[PDB]
């Protein structure tokens, strides 16, 4: 199970946000990490490009990772999901199971209203 907090986030233009994923108690390695989103006004899911405004921290001791997005606009609204990936030399059913699991998702709304700041 992959725990993604929080469930919803509402921010003004210019703010930033942190989504967090936690890979709940297991032997399985956090070998790598993918972020995805579905834009507001679209039902098709695409992947995020780490770098720039999109700061990722990965802490594999604690089997956690997080996505920080700075300087939001209305273009960052959508639903965000993390997916972990756990590699093994020879087959471990437990860790294979894990490569099919996404975070719960975070619905993110960015308001661009007049006279409205942080």
């Amino acid at each position: 199970r992959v725990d993604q907090t929080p469930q919803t986030i509402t921010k003004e233009t210019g703010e930033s946000l942190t989504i967090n994923c936690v890979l709940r108690d297991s032997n399985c390695a956090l070998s790598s990490t993918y972020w995805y989103r579905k834009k507001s006004g679209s039902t098709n899911e695409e992947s995020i490009s780490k770098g720039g405004r999109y700061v990722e921290t990965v802490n594999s001791g604690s089997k956690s990772f997080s996505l920080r997005i700075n300087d939001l606009t209305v273009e960052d609204s959508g639903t965000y999901r993390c997916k972990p990936e756990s590699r093994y030399g020879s087959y471990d059913a437990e860790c294979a199971a894990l490569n099919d699991q996404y975070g719960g998702g975070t619905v993110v709304t960015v308001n661009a209203a007049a006279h409205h700041h942080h």
Partner: protein
């Protein structure tokens, strides 16, 4: 080919596995014991449609491609047929990248269940290395 135990121990010493990444030779001989039973031809089909191949049972999802595993990432850059060889080279060198993937010998579940925490030296004893 079915390796005998000290035969495999002598080839692994020659291929540089002894203390590779801090893991002494016994660990490696022991792993091939409980993954393959020392059988270079061993293959096992797993329920995700991946396959584990050769003396260290390397998985076709991550390390080698075999044309019938969904999403194969082929991290060792080799066809899986290469790992079914009599010559342990391909498997050894792919073992070396695996053990370097972040998780040490914990990548091999048979290793983790039967060798980790045990006196693994025993597996090279009486081999006159």
């Amino acid at each position: 080919k079915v390796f005998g135990r000290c035969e495999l121990a002598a080839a692994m010493k020659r291929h540089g596995l002894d203390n590779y990444r801090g893991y002494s030779l016994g660990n490696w001989v022991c792993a091939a014991k409980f993954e393959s039973n020392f059988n270079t031809q061993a293959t096992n089909r797993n329920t995700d449609g991946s396959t584990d191949y050769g003396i260290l049972q390397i998985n076709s999802r991550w390390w080698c491609n075999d044309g019938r595993t969904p999403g194969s990432r082929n991290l060792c850059n080799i066809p899986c047929s290469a790992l079914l060889s009599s010559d342990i080279t391909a498997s050894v060198n792919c073992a070396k990248k695996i053990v370097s993937d972040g998780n040490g010998m914990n990548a091999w579940v048979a290793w983790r269940n039967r060798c980790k925490g045990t006196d693994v030296q025993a597996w090279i004893r009486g081999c006159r290395l």
